[PDB]
């Protein structure tokens, strides 16, 4: 023991625990940001998919390479990951699944192609031995899809000059504002729908312009809008897990400080019935 | 009768039943009725109609985008679009005068490339916000 260093650490885990406070505050408020975001992006994506889901089952077709269902020699994985720390297990946990889903792949002798969209993926995946293609870090507080179409672009290109076959994105689903669960989903190649095809309806703008082309363009968007919905709901659990966390070291420090002025005390009072001791003895 | 959406691309501009609409397109202006044909592609600046249960419009515009016609319910991707109650009339006028002036302060093609486009999202204002009055 000793009287002088314990309180000194008494001082620091004090100081600690208050700063574990002001943390959870600020990421709560970043929460609140966030998740307006996402508000904001949630119709422009689902109309988008609703979209593509009624082009998956209607008539007078053309086929497309982004719609058809090929064979599967590669895949192609888009991963969202946060810089920082202080955030949890949450870009382990999604990277520990995304490396269940590779292993599947590996069995079948199907390889990875990996795009990281923060540093914890590029660091983690480059010093495990998966084959980053792409990567961009440090998004900042607001993310843009101008900075992420970059990557996209990349894995884009590596679907349609033919080498990639199949394209997922993993991300972590904010369920609720104290539940998040990390998921792998089908990007690309058109995931199914329930319907048949609608006759009728105005007028089939299709063949005003070229429909290849203006079906290329959509089919654009489709994607990027899907990735940008992706990496704002990550933030926004990014930013729960973070407070979370918060909450957590902040009790522990309280734990450590009640405990560690028990040694304090009992240090205190033994030192003083020591000397005590020394000086009644002493006068003999 | 049938359902339509519209979204600003980070914005939700409609959703919800709708009885008949008109409709700006790959060309020009156009006029939409329920029921008729089945594919889709682009927008032209302009502007849309939303008549609804018992006879009810709307006017909204757009600045650009894609349009499905096709489906029952359909819907509108634009790449940016604003409420009819958002936009004024004064905003359309300055849009007026920021065109206007562009056009004056154009001279090549690969700039009125650009010119050309604000001149037709200024008109599409000033269309909607006139048939805002109905």
């Known amino acids: 023991a000793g009287a002088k260093d314990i309180r000194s650490k008494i001082a620091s885990v004090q100081n600690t625990q208050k700063i574990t406070k002001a943390m959870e505050m600020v990421a709560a408020s970043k929460m609140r940001k966030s998740q307006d975001r996402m508000a904001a992006s949630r119709p422009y994506a689902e109309t988008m998919r609703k979209v593509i889901g009624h082009l998956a089952h209607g008539n007078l077709e053309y086929k497309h390479p982004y719609l058809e269902d090929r064979d599967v020699k590669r895949v192609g994985y888009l991963v969202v990951s946060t810089d920082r720390g202080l955030a949890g297990g949450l870009n382990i946990n999604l990277f520990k699944k995304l490396l269940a889903e590779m292993k599947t792949w590996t069995d079948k002798?199907?390889?990875?192609?990996?795009?990281?969209?923060?540093?914890?993926?590029?660091?983690?995946?480059?010093?495990?031995?998966?084959?980053?293609?792409?990567?961009?870090?440090?998004?900042?507080?607001?993310?843009?899809?101008?900075?992420?179409?970059?990557?996209?672009?990349?894995?884009?290109?590596?679907?349609?000059?033919?080498?990639?076959?199949?394209?997922?994105?993993?991300?972590?689903?904010?369920?609720?504002?104290?539940?998040?669960?990390?998921?792998?989903?089908?990007?690309?190649?058109?995931?199914?729908?329930?319907?048949?095809?609608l006759k009728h309806k105005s007028w089939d703008y299709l063949y005003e312009p070229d429909p290849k082309a203006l079906l290329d363009t959509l089919l654009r968007r489709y994607v990027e809008s899907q990735v940008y919905q992706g990496v704002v709901e990550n933030l926004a659990s990014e930013q729960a897990a973070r407070m979370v966390a918060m909450k957590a070291a902040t009790d522990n420090g309280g734990s450590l400080i009640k405990e560690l002025q028990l040694v304090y005390n009992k240090a205190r009072q033994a030192s003083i019935t020591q000397e005590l001791t020394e000086i009644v003895s002493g006068a003999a | 009768t049938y359902h339509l959406d519209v979204v600003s691309a980070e914005q939700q501009m409609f959703s919800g039943l709708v009885e008949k609409i008109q409709v700006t397109g790959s060309e020009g202006e156009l006029g939409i009725y329920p029921g008729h044909a089945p594919l889709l592609t682009?927008?032209?600046?302009?502007?849309?109609?939303?008549?609804?249960?018992?006879?009810?419009?709307?006017?909204?515009?757009?600045?650009?985008?894609?349009?499905?016609?096709?489906?029952?319910?359909?819907?509108?991707?634009?790449?940016?679009a604003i409420r009819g109650q958002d936009l004024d009339e004064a905003r359309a006028m300055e849009a007026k005068r920021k065109a206007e002036e562009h056009i004056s302060s154009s001279h090549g093609d690969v700039d009125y490339a650009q010119a050309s486009a604000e001149l037709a999202k200024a008109i599409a204002q000033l269309r909607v916000i006139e048939l805002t009055k109905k």
């Open chain 1, 109 to 197: 002798g199907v390889q990875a192609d990996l795009a990281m969209i923060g540093s914890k993926g590029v660091s983690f995946f480059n010093s495990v031995g998966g084959n980053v293609v792409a990567q961009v870090t440090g998004m900042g507080d607001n993310p843009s899809l101008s900075e992420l179409i970059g990557p996209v672009k990349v894995m884009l290109q590596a679907y349609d000059e033919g080498r990639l076959d199949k394209l997922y994105i993993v991300s972590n689903k904010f369920i609720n504002t104290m539940s998040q669960v990390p998921t792998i989903s089908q990007l690309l190649p058109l995931p199914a729908s329930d319907d048949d095809d």
């Open chain 2, 42 to 80: 682009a927008i032209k600046p302009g502007m849309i109609r939303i008549v609804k249960q018992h006879g009810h419009e709307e006017f909204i515009y757009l600045s650009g985008g894609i349009l499905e016609v096709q489906p029952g319910n359909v819907t509108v991707l634009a790449d940016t």
